[PDB]
Amino acid sequence: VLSDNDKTNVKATWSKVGDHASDYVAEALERMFFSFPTTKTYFPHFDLSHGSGQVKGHGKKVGEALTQAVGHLDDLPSALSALSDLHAHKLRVDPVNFKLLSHCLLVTLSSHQPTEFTPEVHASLDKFLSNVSTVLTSKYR
Amino acid sequence: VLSDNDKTNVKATWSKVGDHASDYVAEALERMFFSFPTTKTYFPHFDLSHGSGQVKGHGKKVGEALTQAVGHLDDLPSALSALSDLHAHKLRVDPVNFKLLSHCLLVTLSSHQPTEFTPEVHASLDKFLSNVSTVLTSKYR
Amino acid sequence: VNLTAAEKTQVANLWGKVNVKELGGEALSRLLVVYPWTRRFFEHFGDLSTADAVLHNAKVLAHGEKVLTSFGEGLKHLDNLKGTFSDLSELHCDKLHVDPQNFRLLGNVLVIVLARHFGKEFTPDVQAAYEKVVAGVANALAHKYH
Amino acid sequence: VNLTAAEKTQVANLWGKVNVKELGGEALSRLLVVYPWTRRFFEHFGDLSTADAVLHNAKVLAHGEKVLTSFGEGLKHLDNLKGTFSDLSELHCDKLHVDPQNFRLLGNVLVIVLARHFGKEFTPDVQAAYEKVVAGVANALAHKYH
Ligand code: HEM
Ligand code: HEM
Ligand code: HEM
Ligand code: HEM
16 A cells, blocks of 8 residues: 555546546556557557547546545555456456556656656556556466 | 456465475576576675575575465555565566576476476466566556 | 587486477476467367367377477587578468567476476576477577567 | 658658656656666666655656657667667666566557647547557567567
């Protein structure tokens, strides 16, 4: 579980993202697909071009899951259990790809909220996204 | 925490290593220093040549810690807490290096106990060494 | 790759004793058992649902022989791994989009398999030579990503 | 590195607006804050005991300007990163023994720093170009390990 200081920073940052969560996560997914084209092969069923309704819809869902995580930092395994089964068992997502999406979430937050994105906030958000990624890949134990 | 099946495999394998633990870990450390010379810089105070008393002594200590871990699979954070502080806070060991030592432990076990080192035993031991490594680097949260 | 002359002969001597059918099936099946996400690339080989399914999969075992035969082509061309693996880099990067971290994992499993079969013969010095070789093969296969 | 012509001009245009003193201190200090084991290599720069110590360390901040100046030398020689970084690869690999994974982490932090300063200008297309560049610089700096 995240340290107290990191939990505080993550909840502060997420509160400042506010209603921009779905737009920012959709942008993070676009950044991942553009920068790391290997990741596109998990979404052959989507239109991945800019302005994609499927990517926008998906960003909203992923943003909702991250909002749930920020509310359940002490029980991420249970809060995310169905998503862990989806990503590790059904989809077999390569663990490297969670790093790529986490990096693109940090790029997106840094670009949109530069004053808020201090080195300490960066460190706490990196730890939050690592902990979410660890839970989503837990089947690989 | 490791799954039941993995705990069983790890305790079976460690029991078969038995009194060879100190010799096998010392060999794993030698394999790491020979194969991955970047790791030698954490031990400038040791003679790292073959037959080193310091490497042999160290292998015994690391083997003892692994034996403790195999006995405390449900509370690795507490069982290894002083070692976590040593490796992440005092020594600042790069997380990549735990992968290198874990791989060299698997090479050493596979070489010495080939019949015992099945694909399922390999998978369970890889997960055990990942979980020990995660606890030892937990300060990097 | 920069192998000493002593390491070049260690590498070539051990490889001369390798059963590429037995050890290549073993290496690829261990990759899919130990790092299960790699099964995503082989779903068209049939049942990969459990480790026991992977270990009995005739296509996975046959494919592993192809992979070790290709590693042996690397060993013959240590001065030109990039060219030796050019076509295969295009396949894995441009067609299959395998993340190149996985190439390192398969090299890890190959070293473990060699240790299992060679025992005391796979000394720390012989391992270190193979570690240089599998790093160079991985880097070469990743070239089309660079 | 293979940049399109459009990506070559995006990279060069953004770099023309970079304050290498401000962003280079920021990048190196963020590496040491976010990935604390990297402090091991800089212990001789004085107090690195806390993030606040890292962020106020005059030597860490000055050193970061050197690092970004060297990245800018890469940008001038995208066709020959290996040669441009040869000497620095020897230093980091042969003298300092920095694990090359860390080169990728510093590139990650540089992309984040560019995004912070350039905002809406650091579009997904401009990021993708920089991702190719920092991957190529990392691979080049790691060459003496190969
Ligand atoms: C922070 C990391 C992630 C989170 C929180 C996240 C969350 C989610 C959520 C909430 C869903 C929808 C689940 C449902 O409809 O029941 C989903 C689906 C999916 N995710 Fe992720 N995910 C993450 C990382 C990744 C990565 C790294 C990849 C691959 C590069 C990935 C690939 C997929 C795919 C292919 C689907 C199914 C998409 C569809 O058919 O609509 N996810 N994820
Ligand atoms: C499974 C992983 C590891 C375990 C279980 C382990 C365990 C231990 C133990 C038991 C000690 C002695 C502690 C004491 O004397 O109080 C120790 C010390 C030390 N370890 Fe590790 N370690 C691991 C990985 C690593 C790695 C990957 C490195 C660096 C490559 C490392 C570098 C060191 C160093 C430099 C010392 C102090 C040595 C001395 O001065 O005698 N350890 N470790
Ligand atoms: C890094 C060492 C590797 C070597 C030397 C290697 C070698 C080869 C070779 C020789 C082929 C057959 C080429 C042909 O028929 O034209 C092949 C195909 C393939 N490789 Fe690899 N490979 C490596 C790693 C991997 C990894 C790590 C993965 C996935 C996790 C992978 C996935 C595949 C797939 C999916 C095929 C095509 C299978 C099919 O025929 O449908 N390879 N590889
Ligand atoms: C990958 C991108 C990097 C670039 C372009 C880079 C660039 C440079 C440059 C230009 C120097 C000064 C060279 C000289 O004075 O001759 C240097 C020194 C150094 N670099 Fe890096 N570096 C990189 C990554 C890293 C990483 C990731 C680390 C450690 C985690 C590191 C640790 C050092 C150290 C310890 C020095 C010597 C400091 C001293 O003067 O005592 N470098 N680097």
